[PDB]
């Protein structure tokens, strides 16, 4: 009985997220029928620390069996697409690696990893590059997002 709604994420410079092969998202400008190739996120609202403007949340991809997860690589938190049993998920009580804080700093969304605080879902300035986990908010990358609701 978890509250999950469907949507598409877009970055502050108007890039969309698409699938780049089985376990990676990329951010690029889409025009016209290209735009039907954007990934739809099933964002499941989950239990965790609710501070001022932060709402805990999880991010799966409509029936691909995939959730966005933060894991360590070379002792560095990294964004990864993670397959999972679809009869189990979505759930309220979920492993911190799948969990993001939905921050609303301006009139825009940040997504901070719950396991790695101060690490955000980020895009590059150059289009068609990976969605990654970025360690600064005050660096040269894009951490600021718009959401557009889909049913």
């Amino acid at each position: 009985p978890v509250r999950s709604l469907n949507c598409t994420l877009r970055d502050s410079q108007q890039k969309s997220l698409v699938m780049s092969g089985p376990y990676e998202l990329k951010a690029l400008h889409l025009q016209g029928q290209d735009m039907e190739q954007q990934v739809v996120f099933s964002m499941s609202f989950v239990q965790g620390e609710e501070s001022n403007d932060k709402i805990p949340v999880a991010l799966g991809l409509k029936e691909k069996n995939l959730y966005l997860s933060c894991v360590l690589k070379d002792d560095k938190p990294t964004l990864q697409l993670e397959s999972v049993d679809p009869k189990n998920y979505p759930k309220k009580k979920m492993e911190k690696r799948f969990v993001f804080n939905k921050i609303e700093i301006n009139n825009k969304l940040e997504f901070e990893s719950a396991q790695f605080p101060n690490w955000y879902i980020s895009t590059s300035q150059a289009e068609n590059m990976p969605v990654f986990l970025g360690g600064t908010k005050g660096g040269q990358d894009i951490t600021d997002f718009t959401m557009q609701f889909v049913s």
Partner: antibody
Amino acid sequence: EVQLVESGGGLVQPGGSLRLSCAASGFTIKDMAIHWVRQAPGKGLEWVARIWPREGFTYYADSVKGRFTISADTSKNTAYLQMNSLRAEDTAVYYCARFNGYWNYIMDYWGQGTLVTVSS
Amino acid sequence: DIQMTQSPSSLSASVGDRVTITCRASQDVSWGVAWYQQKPGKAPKLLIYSTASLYSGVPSRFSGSGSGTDFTLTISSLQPEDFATYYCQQYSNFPITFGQGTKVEIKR
């Protein structure tokens, strides 16, 4: 000798068609974007369109959307700009240029440009 | 269609001294700004990408700074082969847009 070479330019009638082509030597375009940019006689640069050859993603300036078609043959290492309904306004040197964000190829190589004159 | 107002349109200066070209953005383009040198009748070549990173092979007198809306190109000391026009571009928002450029003419 990393190279983008253009051809197909020249003098056409208004309301005509012309295909420009942009051949890559010294790199494969399969993981590059090819942008087209144009420079009207005694004016600045204006962005026309771009294609990601592998994915087929295309993107047009509003002034050319509908009239022009950008495409790419990865097996010929070559990109295309099909121009239709040509007007005097499309008279320019047309450049093609490569883009790859990861390798900092931010229109680092440009073609020599091909002059397109639309006149009766 | 984000405008990129570039200034001045025309500049003049003598070999060995420093020059500043400025470029202003109609709205916020983050750090997605590049600088291009065009010799007449020739293809532009890349100098600076991502506001301030210097492209492989470019002389280290060429410098880029910027703050979200206001961006600036600096050359610390001109040399022979810098008679050119210089263009700023934003590549973070589509459509990509340029400035009308600035002609750099060497004074004698």
